[PDB]
Structure formats: structure tokens, C-alpha cells
Amino acid sequence: KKRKKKSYTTPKKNKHKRKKVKLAVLKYYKVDENGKISRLRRECPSDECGAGVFMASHFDRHYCGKCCLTYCFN
């Protein structure tokens, strides 16, 4: 046998790259007439998730990890 040579495409693919904030500021914010941390993210009504769970409010859908509910805005 020879070397199998799995190198026809993709000269060197690597692991997925994930970049994270040093301390997340997109989760809580000011400007709600409140002196406490103001809620802009949607609160999960499910018991198995909670207020520390932040379903990422992207341009579409809600992404949870355990139930993955979807809300349409139109």
C-alpha cells in the first residue's frame, strides 16, 4: 500500500474559531429608566431554562441549546 493522501482539497483545515468578549456587555445594558441591570434579552418561560440562559437574539430565530424555541416577527 501507499500513502492514502487525503489532500485533494482544503490544503489545511483547522478547528472552529470562537472569539468571546472579555466581559460580556451585550447581555445587560443601561437606558431603560432603571438603576438595576435592564432586561433587553427575552426571558425564557420554560422552567428547564432561566434568566441566566441568553437565547442569542440574532437577526433570526431564538437559539437556546435545550429546547430551541422560535418566534417570528415578520
Binding site: V25, K27, G35, I37, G50, A51, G52
Partner: protein, 121 residues
């Protein structure tokens, strides 16, 4: 030979470490604080982020919890045995939120008593 908060903090942080605890960063702390599972958090002193410190003050105002401000943290970092990663590098210990009430399920000390006395005043 005299007990105080400056010496009770070592014992309480060590007890938390023996039982996990020490919530590094804001993540994994929002759940507990919104469920009111914590009653003593230690924050970094001389923190250079004004938004983070004001947010932490607001979060403390939410649940009415004092946060201890102690300078010269390098002694605490040496005490917690923080070099880690065998002997390569040097991570630093700057913030920790302790879960399940003030004391974990492990040992109980008069450090808890003196910290609670400082908390009530």
C-alpha cells in the same frame, strides 16, 4: 493570632475552591444571582472597566449584597495556589461568585462568623 476579614477571606475562598465555586467572570453567575443562589461575591479591586464595575454595583443593589474591596491581591493569589498548569505560565485569580448560600457543604469555621459580622455592619 487575631482573626479578621483579611484572614477569613483566605479560608472561605479556599473552602470554596475545595468545593468548586469561585465563578470566574460574569458567565455562570447570572443564573445563580437571578435565582438568588449566592450571598457573597468577591470582585476584582482596581478594575479598569467602568461599565463592569457599575454593572456589578447595580447587580449588588438588586439583591442587597455587599462586595469586599481589598487591595494588594498578590498575597491572596499566592495563598490560593494559583500558578496552575503544572508550572507553566501564571493565571491570576481576580473574581469569584460562591454558590449555595454563604458556606458550602464542607467544613464550617469561625471565618464564616466574622465574615457575617462584617456583612451585618
Amino acid at each position: 493570632g487575631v482573626m479578621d476579614v483579611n484572614t477569613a477571606l483566605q479560608e472561605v475562598l479556599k473552602t470554596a475552591l475545595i468545593h468548586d465555586g469561585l465563578a470566574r467572570g460574569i458567565r455562570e453567575a447570572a443564573k445563580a444571582l437571578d435565582k438568588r443562589q449566592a450571598h457573597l461575591c468577591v470582585l476584582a479591586s482596581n478594575c479598569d472597566e467602568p461599565m463592569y464595575v457599575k454593572l456589578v454595583e447595580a447587580l449588588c443593589a438588586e439583591h442587597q449584597i455587599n462586595l469586599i474591596k481589598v487591595d494588594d491581591n498578590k498575597k491572596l493569589g499566592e495563598w490560593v495556589g494559583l500558578c496552575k498548569i503544572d508550572r507553566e505560565g501564571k493565571p491570576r485569580k481576580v473574581v469569584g461568585c460562591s454558590c449555595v448560600v454563604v458556606k458550602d457543604y464542607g467544613k464550617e469555621s469561625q471565618a464564616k462568623d466574622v465574615i457575617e459580622e462584617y456583612f451585618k455592619c
